[model samples]
Target: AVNPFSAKYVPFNAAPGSTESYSLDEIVYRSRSGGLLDVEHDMEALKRFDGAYWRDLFDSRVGKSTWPYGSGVWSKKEWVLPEIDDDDIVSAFEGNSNLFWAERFGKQFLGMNDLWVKHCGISHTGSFKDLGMTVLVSQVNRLRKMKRPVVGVGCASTGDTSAALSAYCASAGIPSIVFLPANKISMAQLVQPIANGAFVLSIDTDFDGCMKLIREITAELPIYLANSLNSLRLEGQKTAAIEILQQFDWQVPDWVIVPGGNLGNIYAFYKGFKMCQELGLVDRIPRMVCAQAANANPLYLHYKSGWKDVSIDRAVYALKKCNGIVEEATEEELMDAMAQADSTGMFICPHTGVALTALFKLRNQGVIAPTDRTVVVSTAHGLKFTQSKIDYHSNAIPDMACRFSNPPVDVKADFGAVMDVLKSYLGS
Candidate 1:
């Protein structure tokens, strides 16, 4: 079927000129990628701005609004697009999952564990990336008038973003390309995108190498970059934070725990919070915590050393000395804005290992006060990186499935046999 939204495509090669010509409110309207604040004045007024200013802004932009699906607790207006409906948005929220206040790490945190583990994972292609990809791909098709099919690209992922792009693009009949470190992804991770008809290219390098390839390819190929580097992806990803605030009845969380890779997701999260604040969707700001894999913990080291830029040699040396792992992009720039935030902090340990670890530390340090609420984002499921777990946990499985094992079989295939094995494992 021909996509009704498809129109004449326009390539945005250059940045949108200067802010001088636009007023604060106009600037907010023009920025496609969400996350900028609508300040009445320039730097001077911003310097004097406090939490109260943020509260007022939140009300203006996203406070007490309603979408066609329901009242948008923080969003100012209902999302409008051709052929999309309130049911579509409401369908996304279907299923049993609780978004409630609870205690964790000896403090009050938004215990979204059930919601995160259940409904969020049930998203179209799995993972929260669907929230972003749906809006992004739709916008590209509608507003941009992208006539020819476009391929989306990105770096290493457990499965989420690639699956999201593949599924959406496939549904739209738009071709997509995903690059990732060869052999680094799990069988389940690798198959989903390919099954959705995306051209999956596995590079025998790290995440940074895949990112580099994506950069080079977008310059030469007809494909549009689907990575977070694309401003549009940020536009879509920001909705997650907006939804979070709205789900909480426009009260911002005390803290947000985000699993960090290229730092794009957390950066986007902060942008959403800032936008909601500027628009007056919520009344306060939440502290952000960046959680990283200890193996590739460049951001954490930078945070510790107070060095924003590190030479390639220094980065390699630190990686080897500190954690026996090497990270690419040694000369890469860390987000200094986050480091400078009074309420923000950084933590690194094995990706899954240190998620709760950082939360525990913050609790002990009294950084996350007893009354504060927090949300932890699990970027990828633990089972995706079985090799990493084997390396970290050092466990032996005699009947483990091989990499290319299709339709893996077990010694005891029957239900009774499976039950017996489970009972034995459970010491029953």
Candidate 2:
């Protein structure tokens, strides 16, 4: 069958009557005016098929044995990269992640009964980057097979992005290169690339500086870039948004809270929900809430200033279109929220903690109601950030009260001592 759906690179928010564009097969990152590029889909072609046609088509492929189709990202291939051949696609059957009901946590802490946690981290790479990396690496595979000038895929990453990129490239037997700022990232972040056999370079600089170095290197070499700046990454990451609506039986939630760093994910989610709304799979898009760690919050500060704004164009446009809100979480606030959630049987990462903190603040301010269907996106698994949790539980962090610390009780092995400790714990 001939493929009807297609997408290409166009300058994001181009001025009126601008005609500059590029084929998706080309190795272009920025437009002629040095602006960010976006994947412009053939919306008219997509609209030809009614909403029910697309909805039923997507629903039929979940948990199937079909190659590539079983992958949550590939299952929405038409909405993603429709023209890519199935054989060129690299996948780990990633996506279709668990949408957990935060019943206990919600009721006990927030007085909300319809809260949920989207576990995007419980996947092949233990992070949500798997959703995007799969598509990026697959496209790289296609580019290489087409005799494109690409030699290897490379990215400057501190954590999950490197894990997803290296793992996907290794699975495809493609040479992968990683750049990290020396002594800046945690050991957990460094370990993944080394284990995956990627050529790792610990450059002497911070993450942003390291990224600049990689950008220069990629421009000079035959290496294909694999960063969130690339529009293709967001294309796959957007699937998580669609998956959320799908999991809820196409019911649009009231709100979605996501933790942000470089801000690509917030835009990716907006595109996902916006596309669904535009294409008739859903009636409305949820109000997106972006949560940031106070120590590293650009978007939050931008939002706070009311009119002063802009680091990421895509993120700004997304927020403007969705009437989105950006909130921040301090170290104490995020850790405490994390502990509260852990106590209620959740093992969430610090990023997820940041999101929960936003939800808590919003709920307290009466912005989000008790019965609203809300989803807090868990970006990474708890295991990856266990060290931070340990510090909090041990009350080691400085100047802050680890109010929910659950340190182990030190008691003698004697029956009387054990009974005393147990009785006291039980009585409390």
lDDT of each: 0.46, 0.89
lDDT of 2 at 147: 88
**Model 1 lDDT at residue 192:** 77
Question: Candidate 2 on 1-428: residue-level lDDT in tens?
Answer: 58888999988876789988899898887888877888889999999999898889999998899887898999999999999999999999899999999999999999999999999889987999999998899999999998898899887776889889999999888999877777775666678888999998877787688867876877788898776568888899999999999999999999999898878899999999999999999999999998999998477878887738522767878888888888899989999999998888888899999999999999988999999999999999998988888998899999989999999999876999999999998999
lDDT of 1 by residue, 313-349 (tens): 3223323322322112211111111111101122112
Alpha-carbon runs more than 4 Å astray in model 1: 1-119, 143-158, 179-187, 201-221, 306-353, 381-394, 397-428
Q: Candidate 2: lDDT of 202?
A: 72
The clash count of every prediction, one per candidate, is 17, 0
TM-score of each: 0.56, 0.95
Number of the top-ranking candidate, with lDDT as the measure: 2
Residue clash pairs of candidate 2: none
* Per-candidate RMSD, Å: 11.8, 1.9
